[PDB]
Design a binder for this molecule. Structure first.
Ligand SMILES: O[C@@H]1[C@@H](O)[C@H](O)OC[C@H]1O
Ligand SMILES: O[C@@H]1[C@@H](O)[C@H](O)OC[C@H]1O
Lengths: 273, 122, 273, 122
């Protein structure tokens, strides 16, 4: 017999963060009797994500769960799908100005503020910070940087002296970090805002030494990040409930289909790992 | 049989392609026989997709459903374009539909070549 | 045995002007022992033309003959092909800042000046003119409008009161003309700068009447345009040697391959047809 | 035979697709086995295209030449990307090559599905 098909569109398909979201979606789908089709580009592209969203709309799938890379850019296609009877859920970045039935993911501005509070605990109220973000024009990255900046401006005298982008690539995270440490005199800490940024930054700090003149606060609980926390290269990471996002999003879609009726962030330090 | 299935799958792909081509020419010049051919070719693609759906297994079932629905979207976009065109409306009013019809037809091509590969692999 | 393959990329594939260019290319190709692959989008798109050019480059064809829709946009791909050993010829719009071996087509600014001289003969040195162009940002259209404008500014007191675009579509040419005749009080003449514009304008003038309060000077010698000249709906058309463009371009490509070693415009009036 | 030809054509398409996929993963994470698979799969696509070229007729000859050359372009773009990657250069230095490799691999897919249709139609 044939099952409802739910389309899940990721930021980056190969990434281990999205694989964890996928796992959560598959768990919910098996429980609810649906099939998940998991899609995404190799390199981050709003354009490519929208084409995939357009394909699912045309195919009139039973539901779409989509990442939102850029503010305002998904509204048109999301609303068009909703209008055509396809329930749409946004995941791990929202499109607030759209008629999607629900957003499942982190409050990203808040997560930034949380990082900001932890940054003050880590190095105090005075010093220089540099930011490595996963794409300059990526929505949930800008939101994380926004919350962070706001926080340390209200609650410290920490100076952000450099902000650049990894495009959420691992190698480019290392290189942009190495470039930031060079070209800046006294950096005390790095804030890394997507999953691979912290791993790339740790590589760049370990390679110049600067372990430990430079602390790292990064995002997510990937294996190498947890390992870098145990080994002291990373001081704190901000952890999201990725598996739970995938799980909850499928159940919301299946609830809508069947006519039935903001996930916190956690700071992890070496004592926690 | 598996060969007959991919003959049919290839026929569907040709129908969709030929339907698009005639559709395009019709919007660009209005020759009534182009619209007639546009319409005949989607009728044939639709019926043959329906025929394959009758004899589908556990996997192709999902692809055929996607392809069948996607063809319906093409039918809707192309009919809306034809409708605005024949009403002599500004290009601005059917630009999106006109574009979507091309895009959606290309999605149909990908489902079809996927199907053909699956039939090829018994 | 296998023949060299020459790729010909058109502005618009279905258009009868490009079909005449194709015919000229096929004639030369049969004489020289080559095969022509004739490509182009349905609706004008620089992006789509460049993808086709990219495909031919990747396939390392024996030669590429390409239309150039937008200034500066083809330079990169043209030079890349030349560098990879593929002889490139531009046809019926040029990319001057590129290393293409030759341009085969009209001097489009000059063709505009020619239209300007004929416009003065048709309605005199005083009056109001409106322009219908085949795409606002299309290179050889802008060049035709440029030459025309320059001419009538130097040699008359003719006022250009409205300029709009057909996007080189037949129906849209009629509609934009009907819209221009409405919304302007005393228009004496229309200047139409791509092949279908004149046919669409004639339809709009015949339908409002204004035959004959409004003269039409247009481009190209398509059957319906020649017919509109005989019937008095069109006063003059500027004729290009499209068939000869296709013919000459293939021979230049094949000359380069084999290591061997600006086409005028003509004004046609009713007395000529 | 015509069936054997489209089996081979389907194998080529899978090799190209699998080569791209492994290539992509390699550039994104650097797992050496991904590069090994990238390389093995293009070797196989290249050889089998060569095999079909041995037995080609008047029409497929032209498509096979386009496909063979296009694969060489993919090989060149993907090798240049791998080279800049392993030199730990800025993304800005291999962005174009990285993109072109994806694009060129997609051209190969279209030649392959065209070939498969032609073999299907004896
Ligand atoms: O969007 C994702 C973000 O939430 C995570 O932090 O990093 C990986 C990205 O893909
Ligand atoms: O570029 C072409 C132009 O030369 C002709 O006038 O009109 C048709 C266009 O495609």
């Amino acid at each position: 017999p044939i099952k409802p098909k739910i389309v899940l569109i990721s930021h980056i398909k190969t990434n281990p963060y999205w694989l964890d979201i996928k796992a959560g979606a598959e768990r919910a789908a098996k429980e609810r009797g649906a099939v998940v089709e998991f899609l995404g580009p190799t390199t981050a592209s709003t354009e490519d994500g929208l084409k995939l969203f357009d394909m699912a709309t045309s195919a009139k799938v039973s539901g779409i769960i989509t990442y939102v890379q850029e503010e305002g850019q998904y509204k048109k296609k999301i609303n068009s799908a909703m209008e055509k009877g396809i329930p749409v859920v946004t995941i791990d970045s929202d499109e607030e100005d759209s008629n999607r039935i629900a957003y499942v993911g982190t409050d990203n501005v808040l997560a930034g503020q949380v990082a900001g509070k932890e940054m003050v605990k880590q190095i105090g109220t005075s010093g220089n910070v540099a930011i490595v973000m996963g794409g300059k024009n990526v929505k949930n990255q800008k939101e994380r940087v926004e919350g962070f900046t706001q926080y340390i401006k209200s609650n410290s005298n920490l100076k952000i002296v450099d902000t650049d982008s990894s495009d959420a690539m691992l190698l480019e995270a290392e290189i942009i970090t190495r470039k930031i440490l060079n070209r800046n005199d006294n950096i005390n800490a790095l804030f890394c805002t997507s999953a691979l940024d912290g791993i790339g930054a740790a590589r760049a700090v370990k390679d110049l030494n600067y372990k430990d003149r430079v602390k790292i606060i990064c995002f997510d609980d990937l294996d190498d990040t947890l390992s870098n926390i145990r080994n002291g290269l990373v001081s704190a990471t901000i952890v999201q409930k990725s598996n739970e996002m995938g799980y909850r999003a499928v159940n919301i879609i299946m609830d809508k289909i069947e006519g039935k009726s903001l996930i916190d962030v956690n700071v992890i330090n070496k004592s926690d790992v | 049989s598996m060969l007959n299935n991919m003959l049919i799958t290839n026929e569907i792909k040709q129908h969709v392609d030929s339907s698009l081509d005639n559709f395009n020419q019709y919007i660009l010049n209005g020759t009534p026989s182009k619209k007639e051919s546009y319409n005949n070719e989607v009728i044939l693609a639709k019926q043959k997709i329906g025929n394959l759906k009758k004899n589908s297994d556990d996997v192709n079932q999902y692809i055929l459903r996607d392809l069948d629905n996607t063809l319906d979207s093409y039918i809707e976009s192309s009919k809306n374009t034809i409708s605005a065109y024949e009403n002599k409306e500004g290009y601005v009013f059917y630009y999106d539909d006109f574009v979507a019809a091309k895009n959606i037809a290309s999605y149909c091509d990908a489902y079809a070549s996927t199907l053909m590969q699956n039939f090829l692999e018994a």
